[model samples]
Target chain A: PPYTVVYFPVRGRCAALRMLLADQGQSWKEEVVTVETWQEGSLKASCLYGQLPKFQDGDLTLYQSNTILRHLGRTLGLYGKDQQEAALVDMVNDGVEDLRCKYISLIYTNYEAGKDDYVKALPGQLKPFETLLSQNQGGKTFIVGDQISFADYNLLDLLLIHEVLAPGCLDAFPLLSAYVGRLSARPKLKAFLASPEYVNLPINGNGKQ
Target chain B: PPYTVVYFPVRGRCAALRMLLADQGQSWKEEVVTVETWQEGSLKASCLYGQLPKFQDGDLTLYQSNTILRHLGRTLGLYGKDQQEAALVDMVNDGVEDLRCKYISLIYTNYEAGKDDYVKALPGQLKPFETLLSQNQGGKTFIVGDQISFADYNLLDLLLIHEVLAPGCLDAFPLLSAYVGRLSARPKLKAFLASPEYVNLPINGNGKQ
Candidate 1:
């Protein structure tokens, strides 16, 4: 039996997992739970912990998306090999998650006035990625070592989300723009991005125009 | 040289590190930086990723308190040898952190109204722990396995913070209440809880008395 990833149909919290799994060329079922029917679903019943993005692998089941990401990343050779690099991978992932939280708050809660604030503040935020990518030579290859890593996939997905949510987001950060473009161009990721699962999600800027 | 955990003088985020170190009888430096001082002290300079709760071990530095806790927990033998059990420990730790975020918002932002909601909702919020603790042999021994793990220390410290903030907070959950009290009674932890470092911070129930 293949592994199971249960989450909401929307790209809310489960997007990165789908992308990560896709990057690994792993065959897994994406059981999307609709908001209306989720409360009665077996996956929902199994989530006694009361959270989404729960994963079930054989006899083992786990919650917490980041924890699951780390577990699967390590299992699939996407995360770092050892503790130190694992720590660094987690650091970057958590940092990006923090920024994403801010981005979501800006868009959803205070979109009226915070839109300007986000635009103003985004340059500073993007600068960090630009600097890091430029420094690590993350511009061309991948985030860690020479091969694909969780950090690179995460960063790429985040930039894509940003571009979807806030268009023209990569204007100031050319290096990251190039990096995202390059990562998205990879065959596996490219096919995944163009796949029905991804194309179905509503991009934020779609209604704006 | 020992590792230094940096944060504010308050129990906001740094308390966990202090409690963990004390529980293990490990020697670590606490660099308390005030908000004003932090602004002047190069907020962007020291940390590898420009975040707080930065842990420095010799030449290696790491950020993210949760990540730091896991690293230190492993090094100090506070985490279990079993991989799944260790991951479960992280689940509880992260769960508590999530609860803390919600609790802080309700306590600090919403005040009396929030307290009303908190007191009413706390029972349900705490049921997961009761279930987890009860299902695992139903004793005050540990959250997982037979030995003391980071989950125990985390439960103890978090419960202490809750008790200090709201006296008689744990009365409803007797087993958990006793479990935390038992852990806190450890000589080193008991002493540290009574120390000046913990006492220096002021207590406020948001703006509502």
Candidate 2:
């Protein structure tokens, strides 16, 4: 295989890239790390940042989930049409990452106590993406431009899981709702989303969503 | 002006990019936002991420500090030499950002109570960068490749600030200590670091560091 994803079985940070690979018709190997294996410490100690979701493209091993996403984006011409558009793509991804960080903190650290506050404040957290969509082609196309960039894939996975986290989270934001529906219907992605490989994996390490 | 940075008076997230601009000898307009200006609501509402470090390159408006660094990195020919190096650059930066996030949490949210734990764990936290330096050109060059990429500026700022957070933090790792010393001596960056404009600003907004 040309690519290998070394991660825990859960979807966690690797799902977007897995989805990216699936949607782009790219195949990769999954080097799943069980909890028992992870407790061995040597593997953990060797990892650069001491985290999983380590990705490999051919011989070039890489870590950091976003780095892999951007690498794929750069190599596959999914970054953007131009520099300005690329910046916008980056902006969208960064926003998605911010909210995802908050979501992770809630899920792993304070899910029970923070659930209500997180759900209550979810709209404000999501408002920027909705505004971003409205500004760009009225949310009809991908996040940045007509062609789908890596950000769209990231944003899509984010929106999808949020729906699971707080049901109908996108209902109030019509553009987001429509955007999710539109992107989810893509033949390759729809099939990937439905497949047991994706369906069986939990959205996070902790069983929150 | 060819470039503009909209940020609060504190160095915070903007410091790295500002240092990059200074060291690169690029002139940019600083659209400083006082706390009063930030509290005005309209500006905050208009910002894409509802955050500081909004940047502009001609007509292109961008939010998120890292996005701005990458934009500058892309345009300024400082990202990396190629795709492989670029991926490594992103990996280094993501690690820097991970530590910075924890540092921020300590500074803003739990400085008083969490100080001891944070400081105690600081060595383990700083070890990764030392290990990274050891692998790259025998601790002689930048983080990724010989060329200084966007990650270097970010990493340099991170190391500098961590030194302030816990004095002698780099003492255990001679490579990191030497890395800081070497990177800090670049003629342009040296002057910029010593400048009152850089020196006078508080690192964080809430009087920490």
Candidate 3:
């Protein structure tokens, strides 16, 4: 009985953890909860924390995506070697999640109005990414260090998801566009993206299910 | 020298950290950055990740308000001894931050409509608090456990800042209103709030600042 990650198989909310686990080359159960199963599961889990992407590793049941990411990051030696770098990686990951929320609002809440806001806000967001990436340009071709960390996984996933759902997504920031190209070309990530499990998933740029 | 906590010395962003330090009876130096100092010092210390409420513990400098809180929570033994419980605590804390951003948008972006939108949105935000507090009611006590934790400090600080900035802040959700009252009335917290160091600064709530 391996550690079970319980979430819908959809790439919407649970993909980050799946990607993290995949990046670490860990084997675990991807328990895809159906609508009916989710209803029952959410009742129990929601009573505890009222959220999805819950993970059960042994007797431990945990909530919060980034919290889980940090745990795995520490265990896998991929977050950052030290606390300071780990926290910096976390800051970037958290920022990515924040941008993900804007993407969600753009899709769901106000539709075109939110999309317009996202497009308008894109230039401002890309500048910071450019600055961060530029600072890290001469590094070992990763966000923090030589090895693949959650930061790279997150940044790559953000770009790929956007490209799938929002073509010309990185048009404003050509460097980030090239950066994503470099990251996506990684052997492990490339294989994962090419896998039947991932390739078949109906993910669109705005990350529609 | 004591650990240095850099913020505006107001209850707005840095208060939860201030409260967390107090919970452990840890003494630290509080540096109030003027607008000009914030412009300069933020470049290196806080701007590495780009935000305030940075903490310098010996040689380590940390950023991100909640991440800093979690760091302090761990160092001061305020975070849960169990990793799972700690993650849950963090989930709730992040949830609170999510709600804070919602409030921020209304206060900073949409304040043009006066307090009407905020007043209307208060119930939705307050409902989650009501539910969480009711489930974890510690009998005129803390949010998480019988003793104080970082979460308790967070809840108390947020309530205090909100109450003073927006009069009648807790007009809805009587339980939360009472809970904040009970939490803040603690002898140590009371003293801290009354300290000359904990002065109210003009919140950029109306976005005019």
Candidate 4:
């Protein structure tokens, strides 16, 4: 494959980009790092930020999941049509990232203690996505423009994981619920989601979510 | 001015973009939100992500600090000369953001409980930046390429705050130290850093850092 994703066996941060690739009909290899292997410290030390989901496209290697997403967005024509739209795309992605950050912290670090407050505040946190959807084409099309941007993949993954984290979370927001269903039904993505490669893996590294 | 930054009185996440505008010789207005006003919740409610550092460039209003940075980078010709360099720039910025996220969590949520562990593990977290510097012109120039990009401002702010958080944090890394000195001495940035407008504000919310 022309692209290789170096990450743990779990989805963690790489889920969005994997979905993007699969949905776009692009092929990539996964270089899975086991806990024992990561404990060895050589590869981790070699990583730019001592983290996983390092992506390699030919000789050039990249870190930071959003960086990878944006790079692929640029290269794959998933960013936006113009500068203005690009900024909006970035705005959506950043919103997704903010909530995702809180979600990750809750799952990995504070689940037992912080879950209640997080869940209580979840509706407010998620309402923005619903609002965003409502503003764009009555929530029928993609997130930003008429086409699917890299943010859509990221947002979709976020919604999926949130559904797992809190069932019926999106039910209150009809636009968001429909949006998730609409995106998930895309043939390539539907197949990818159902595939064992995705279904069998844990969503995170620590076995939390 | 065409650019208006809507943020709290504190530097917080807006510091980097403020520095970027200053260093680039671009002018922008600051719309500072006080705690009293923020508590009222109108502006916060209007915010797409319910966070500060909202930015407006002409008719387009954008949230998410990094998104604003990249938008400015794009319009101001600070992104990079080409696609490859742009990816590298995003990579650096994302790395900076990853650390900044952790730093913010420590300051806001875990400072009292996790300060020691955070400081102890700080060097390992910061070494990648030194390595990045070493790879590029022996750390004499910008982080990504020969030209200054938006990531430079973001990374500079990250470095400055880390020094405050952990004194002598960069002393062990000669390249990082020199890099900081080199960037700090830029005339406009120097003036901005020394001014009361920048010096008086807290670096974060919650009265920490």
Candidate 5:
């Protein structure tokens, strides 16, 4: 395979792209870095932003999760049909990223103290996606455009993780709930997700959702 | 005007794109929202993520600061010359976004308590960009490719704000210092930097850098 992912053992940052690659039937190698390995300071300094997951598509080494996703999107023809749709895909993905950052902050930094408030505000935080879905094709399709763009994979992962964070978190939003069901039902993705490789790993490093 | 920026009066999130438009010789209107005006709840609720920096290009309105930048980047030919270059630009922007988030956190949440450590760790945080510059054309050209992309504007903005946050912060990194000086010297960008519209606005909302 021409793809390699260098990241920690946890599903943390690499999950969405992993899902993307599987759903697209692409193959890659995973270079897992244990916490002890990262703490040694050699690999950490080599990372451009001092974080993972580092992605290499052939000789082009890329850092940052979103960058990797966009690269895959562009290369695999999953971006969009037009420039406007591409922008919309980006808008959708950026929203996903903002919420992802907040979710990550809650999970890693303040889970003990911040969980309750974060959970309480989850619906308002999620309402935008529902609204976004409602704007196109009666909330029955992908996040941005007619085709399944890379943003769909990331948003799917975020929604799934949130469901784990707060069970039935998508219950209030029918579109999102349905979205998860539909996207998960895709043959390749379903197989990959249920496989032990995905199920065995923890969602985050600190043992939180 | 083909563009309208709906954001807080502060230069908080919109600075980069405003700089982008000015440098590209494009016209735009600013719809500044005062703090009290935002408190009324109508506009806030209407916002997709309930945040400002809502941008409109023709009829396509968008939110999220980076999304706006990427959108403008796409339409205005500022993304990159090719797919690989575009991915590198995205990588660069994501790094900038990560640092900007940390800076925002310090400014709003723990300015009094976090400033010292944030400043002390500043060099490590900034070293990546310096290294990035060192890889490209003797650190003399753009961030990703030959032409100025949206990430350049955002990185330039980030560097300027950091200089305000930690005076002479770029002094240790010759490449970064030179990059900043070189980018700032672009005639239109230089004019924008010196204009009253840019100068009168604070870097951040809370009077912090």
Candidate 6:
């Protein structure tokens, strides 16, 4: 089935899912909502949670970026090998999400005032991922299991944006640093990252990050 | 297999999952962490994300409350009837989580200073759920499909706690008001709501809400 993603032009919340689709060799359409159009307010009102990254897969329309990720993950065989692995995948994704939320808040709300403290405390925030990697196959593989799950895409995006937000942030966590490098080296994902489609846009909607 | 939930005595993140287990007639144990104990630094250091609502089921251990909820939902067949319904269930849940995050931030950081504005803007935040109910079955039944998916429990907990946070908050949303009433009237959940275990705990840590 064909899929379409609707969001502002920025990579923001949609970047991970975009990476997932690209890495899986899946083709999807993008319906960009420009700032000018969003300022008009009709689409925002119709949005379920007044947010972007609405996804359409055939007859079903889904909102919430993570919901779309999980849906795609389930259908694309990226969830996990079994129920236990699925739970671990969700745990990893949720941890990525918690840190992403903090990063977003810092970027949009408190960049001027909070950047110093946020970057200073960044290691503690990122240590868990390294720990997760260590517990797994010595950080040589995916976050949850041997195969790539949806959480990897989210974590990659998180790490990518964080590096942009605070340069050399991952230098302290060797596993995460290598993991980012490894994921970025995938042929399809590497090309997608280099494409103007991904590089041209800002990291966030409001021209921040 | 047996289940154990590790969290603080407060209802904070575990209330919805606890409600789901109670309403579904599933048994689980709670491993409470006191403020004094958390301050001792060992448990916090051991936590993967340094947060609570850790779950253990048989040989599997999980962190992140939503991960636990989705795992239980998946194992117990409370996710949804099919893939499409499951996506909708996730949509509802991610929406609930979005509001819950905002609610949590306000309660912990800005309650005294921001309560008025937050309550004032709550209707907009809540209207999507009301709209979701209207689209489903006029708010007479479950949030997504006919069955009570895990999202219902989360949404139920969200609405219940919001009522305490902003009295008469649901007065404007007729559909949500009735939806809350209908869900709360379930026999197991009704009894659980009134039981001292749920009633006595603060809605959040630090004694807020």
Candidate 4 vs candidate 5: the TM-score winner is 5
Clashes of each: 0, 0, 6, 0, 0, 0
Model 6 per-residue lDDT at B79:
96
For model 3 chain B, give the 10-residue run with minimal summed lDDT.
B200-209
What DockQ would candidate 2 receive versus the native complex? 0.85
Which ranges in model 6 have alpha carbons more than 4 Å from their true place? none
Instruction: Please give the lDDT score at residue A185 for candidate 6.
Output: 99
Candidate 5 lDDT, tens digit per residue, B1-209? 38999988789889999999999999999898977889989999999889989988898888889988998899899999999999999999999999999999999999999999999999999999998998987688988878999999999999999999899999999988989999999999999999999999999888877
* Candidate number that wins on lDDT, 2 or 5: 5
Candidate 6 global CA lDDT score: 0.92
Docking class of 2: high
**Predicted candidate 1 versus true structure: per-residue lDDT over B97-199, tens digit per residue:** 6677667776677766677677677766676677678867776577766677766766666677667656776788888887887777889989988888777
lDDT of 1 by residue, A1-209 (tens): 26898876666556677788887788788876676767676655556467787888778777877667666675677766666666666666776767776776666677777777777877767676776666566556665555666767667777887786578889878888888888888788789989988888754322321
lDDT minimum window of 10 residues, candidate 2 chain A: A40-49
Structure candidate 2, residue pairs in collision: none
- Tell me how far candidate 5 lies from the true structure as C-alpha RMSD in angstroms: 1.0
Q: TM-score of every model?
A: 0.87, 0.98, 0.76, 0.96, 0.98, 0.97
Error of 6 at A17 (Å): 0.4
- Which scores greater on TM-score, model 1 or model 4? 4
lDDT minimum window of 10 residues, candidate 3 chain A: A200-209
Q: Candidate 4, residues A93-154: lDDT per residue as tens digits?
A: 98998899999989988999998899889999999999999999999999998999999999
- Regions more than 4 Å wrong, model 1: A39-46, A134-140, A144-147, A203-209, B44-51, B202-209
How does chain B score by TM in each prediction? 0.87, 0.98, 0.84, 0.97, 0.98, 0.97
Candidate 3 lDDT, B21-107, residue by residue in tens:
765677898776666776676354425545566778888666667767767776566766565556656666766777667666766
Docking class of 3: acceptable
